[PDB]
């Protein structure tokens, strides 16, 4: 059963770090710039036309 | 948008010259001339769709000029909406 499994998901294995790449800079994309221990300083702190064209580029390709 | 009204008994080649050196337009490397009534305001899906398709595909890519009626109904107006869509 693991063997299958592994094969399963070994042929797409980028597919899958790609998807998780994504999340994982998703993720530190919005986080404060200092690391925990030191954050709470951090958190302190805490407390048209456009689109139409975009739209028809899109629409063109 | 350079407009210009002139004398219907007048000879192209001014016009030309004009246009090249006047007003700054380059010299083609193609002039489609788009004819037909087009009866109706709103123009078949499929005709303008080929129309915007093809025809502008081909001067966008050749780099060309497109004269037609310059109103702003039917072929003359889709025309125009396709080449600003091109563009």
């Known amino acids: ?61 | 948008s350079n407009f210009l009204r002139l004398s219907d008994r007048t000879d192209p080649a001014a016009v030309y010259s004009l246009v090249t050196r006047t007003w700054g337009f380059r010299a083609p490397n193609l002039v489609v001339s788009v004819l037909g009534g087009s009866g109706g305001p709103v123009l078949q899906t499929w005709l303008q769709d080929l129309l915007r398709r093809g025809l502008v595909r081909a001067a966008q890519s050749t780099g060309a000029w497109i004269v037609t009626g310059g109103l702003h109904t039917g072929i003359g107006r889709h025309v125009g909406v396709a080449v600003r869509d091109h563009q």
Request: no cysteine; net charge positive; charged share 25%.
């Open chain 1, 1 to 61: 059963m693991f063997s299958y499994t592994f094969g399963k998901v070994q042929g797409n294995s980028d597919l899958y770090w790609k998807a998780q790449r994504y999340r994982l800079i998703r993720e530190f994309h919005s986080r404060p710039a200092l690391a925990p221990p030191f954050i709470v300083i951090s958190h302190l702190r805490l407390l048209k036309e456009a689109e139409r064209k975009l739209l028809t580029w899109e629409s063109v390709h």
